[PDB]
């Protein structure tokens, strides 16, 4: 029976928490996961205060090597725009990238703005102020979201850019995915970006989005998976899943990563971390798919296992997988 600690990304926290509960039921091993955001995850694994870190934003090969870290992906999720719009039901509103960016720039202030009406010609839109919500904490969901906005809105690209933290033009700060979900629930007229489970499991309305190919798409597990079908995983785990081509490709998709040290000073901890995630790849798909996370292809799992064997060792050089 091991007691493991992880910290970081809230984007996959629902699935990690479910996996950890199940794992403990089945094996007795205990995994404590703190959802503090990706930036904090990276800080804590570098600091050696947890057995594993978690970040939705990948570290570069060079950064990993500088820090003695190894990164591997776990699941594929999607970022949606949770909304609180009087008189509309979930999934009714469509936004495109440009107009979403104009909302986040503060250029569009009301939900019946002409640019929104044009995207939604059959819909009766209220004269409700838009209450923009964004992350307060250093966030991989923010990194994915702003990566997307930079592709689709040039003004955003040039003035705000991409980051886990940026200088938000407008918008109230929510802590974690959970914090944004709570703000959207409490604020008539809100819009906030969250990983899909945080909308669905909180019964929040959400929008459709226009795909890179120009078609309205609903956020679903399958459509997150579709956004990754063009990914050449063999080349790198650090795949960009935003604004990808193809049918039914949800435009704000991302994988998410676990970070561990290559030289495990507590090798039994490291061994057990790998056993937990290996169990999750082998047995955890229904739990992920229940929470609308798409699973990595088997070939990717096999890449991860091969890489564990060559990268994760004790201080004497012995592999821990």
UniProtKB/Swiss-Prot annotation:
Keyword Membrane recorded: no
Q: Which GO terms describe its biological process?
A: DNA damage response; phosphate ion transmembrane transport; phosphate ion transport; response to radiation
Name the domain of life this protein comes from. Answer: Bacteria
> What Pfam families does its record include?
PBP_like_2
The UniProt record describes its induction as:
By phosphate deprivation. Positively regulated by PhoB and negatively regulated by PhoR.
The regions listed as transmembrane in this protein's record are none
GO CC annotation terms, alphabetical: ATP-binding cassette (ABC) transporter complex, substrate-binding subunit-containing; membrane; outer membrane-bounded periplasmic space
Keyword set for this entry? Periplasm, Phosphate transport, Signal, Stress response, Transport
**GO molecular function list:** phosphate ion binding
Quaternary structure and interacting proteins, as annotated: The complex is composed of two ATP-binding proteins (PstB), two transmembrane proteins (PstC and PstA) and a solute-binding protein (PstS).
Name used for this protein in its record = Phosphate-binding protein PstS
């Amino acid at each position: 029976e091991a007691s493991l600690t992880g910290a970081g990304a809230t984007f996959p926290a629902p699935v990690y928490a479910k996996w950890a509960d199940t794992y403990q039921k089945e094996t007795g091993n205990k995994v404590n996961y703190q959802g503090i955001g990706s930036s904090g995850g990276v800080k804590q694994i570098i600091a050696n205060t947890v057995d594993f870190g978690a970040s939705d934003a990948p570290l570069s090969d060079e950064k990993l090597a500088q820090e003695g870290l190894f990164q591997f992906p776990t699941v594929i999720g999607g970022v949606v725009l949770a909304v609180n719009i009087p008189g509309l039901k979930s999934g009714e509103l469509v936004l495109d990238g440009k107009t979403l960016g104009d909302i986040y720039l503060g250029k569009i202030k009301k939900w019946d703005d002409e640019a929104i009406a044009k995207l939604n010609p059959g819909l009766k839109l209220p004269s409700q102020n838009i209450a923009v919500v964004r992350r307060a904490d250093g966030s991989g969901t923010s990194f994915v979201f702003t990566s997307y906005l930079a592709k689709v809105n040039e003004e955003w690209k040039n003035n705000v850019g991409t980051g886990s933290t940026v200088k938000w033009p407008i918008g109230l700060g929510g802590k974690g995915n959970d914090g944004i979900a709570a703000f959207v629930q409490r604020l008539p007229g809100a819009i906030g970006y969250v990983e899909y489970a945080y909308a669905k499991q909180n019964n929040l309305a959400y929008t459709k989005l226009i795909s890179a190919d120009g078609k309205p798409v609903s956020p679903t597990e399958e459509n997150f998976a579709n956004a990754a079908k063009g990914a050449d995983w063999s080349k790198t785990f650090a795949q960009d899943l935003t604004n990808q081509k193809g049918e039914d490709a949800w435009p704000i998709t991302s994988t998410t990563f676990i970070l561990i040290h290559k030289d495990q000073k507590k090798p039994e901890q490291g061994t057990e971390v790998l056993k937990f995630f290996d169990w999750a790849y082998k047995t955890g798909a229904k739990q992920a798919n229940d929470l609308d996370y798409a699973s990595l292809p088997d070939s990717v799992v096999e890449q991860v296992r091969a890489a564990w064997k060559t990268n994760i060792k004790d201080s004497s050089g012995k592999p821990l997988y």
